[PDB]
Amino acid sequence: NAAAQAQRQLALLEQRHGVRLGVQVHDRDSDRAFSHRADERFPMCSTFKLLAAGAVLARADRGDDSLRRLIRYGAADIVAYSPVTGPRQAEGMTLEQLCEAAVTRSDNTAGNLLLSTLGGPPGLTAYARGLGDRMTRLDRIETALNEARPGDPRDTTTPAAMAGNLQRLLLGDALQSASRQRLADWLLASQTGDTRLRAGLPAGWRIGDKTGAGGHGTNNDIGVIWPRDGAPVLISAYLTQSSASREAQNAVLAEVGRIAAHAVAAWRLGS
């Protein structure tokens, strides 16, 4: 069937690029799924920012925080790759501006500032447990969490666990409808994955995605695909142990996107 063909394609792709690849895809239209290593652990890298923004939105939903709250921070708090938070440091930024910077732009200081409102990495882990995710754990802050050492449990998820979180946050009831829309909008506005999953999608399809990259040849992309004419598709793609360049890694993820889009189309056509 289409799921078996997609799984064979992923196995061949993994072998020819010398990587360890973890993928979960779930098409909400046909309700069908396929996966590869979906129960194995992979380093999250910046993909944690999707969860962090979800946790902030959930707090806003229950009145435990406010998206309009102004957060002050110092030059001493700035870490690498902070294109939004760096220039705004003296004036501060609101919680919603920080969520947008973290999700849409992958701003690292923004991610750390979100974590600071959640009780740190332990707060994000607790949030994941509340979503029914028994695997994901965050232990470090940016950029330490990007080490991505094989075998290290810190700062890891599984493709299946993260796909479940995408479902609850974007498509289910973990967030109120308005907050669900905000998160989708921040993800759909991202460009950081233009050469990753999005590059493999048919014309007119959209993806709201969160990328990440780290040590040991780690490069990830997770999100929700909205096809041109179909219900949403959850996708979580984690790649690690590449010996190749970043551009080569990105092209592997683009091919995962093509494999996923073809399976969705095949389920639609009845192939």
Angle at 258 between CA 194 and CA 170, to 5 degrees: 65
The residue ranges of DSSP E strands in the chain, in sequence order, are 20-27, 33-36, 42-43, 70-71, 93-94, 156-157, 206-214, 218-226, 233-240
Q: Is the bond into 94 cis (omega within 30 degrees of 0)?
A: no
Domain residue ranges of the chain, discontinuous segments joined by +? 2-269
User: Which amino acid would we find at residue 49?
Assistant: K
CA 101, 103, 104, 106 torsion: positive or negative?
positive
Q: What count of Cα atoms within 13 Å lies in the side-chain half-sphere of residue 232? A: 18
How many angstroms separate the CA atoms of 172 and 178, rounded? 12
**DSSP 3-state percent helix, strand, coil across the chain (nearest 5):** 50, 15, 35
User: Which amino acid would we find at residue 36?
Assistant: H
Task: Report whether CATH 1.20.1740.10 matches the domain 2-269.
Answer: no
**Distance between alpha carbon 56 and the CA centroid of its chain, in Å?**
16
How many angstroms separate the CA atoms of 226 and 83, rounded? 28
Q: Compute CA distances 260 → 38, 143, 229, 255, whole Å.
A: 14, 30, 15, 9
How many angstroms separate the CA atoms of 179 and 230, rounded? 22
Give me 61's structure tokens. Answer: 């939903």
Q: Reply yes or no on whether 46 is catalytic.
A: yes
How many angstroms separate the CA atoms of 3 and 1, rounded? 5
**Is residue 162 within 8 Å of residue 24, measured between CB atoms?**
yes
Q: Reply yes or no on whether 40 is catalytic.
A: no
How many angstroms separate the CA atoms of 65 and 81, rounded? 26
The data reach a resolution, in angstroms, of 1.0
Q: What technique was this entry resolved by?
A: X-ray
- Out of 14, 96, 100, 142, the active site residue is 142
CA 129, 132, 133, 135 torsion: positive or negative?
positive
Burial zone of 78 (CB within 10 Å; 0-12 exposed, 13-18 middle, 19+ buried) = middle
Burial zone of 26 (CB within 10 Å; 0-12 exposed, 13-18 middle, 19+ buried) = buried
- Out of 46, 82, 236, 242, the active site residue is 46
List of residues 6+ apart from 264 with CB closer than 8 A: 25, 27, 29, 30, 225, 227, 230, 233
Helix axes 177-188, 48-61, angle to 10 degrees: 150
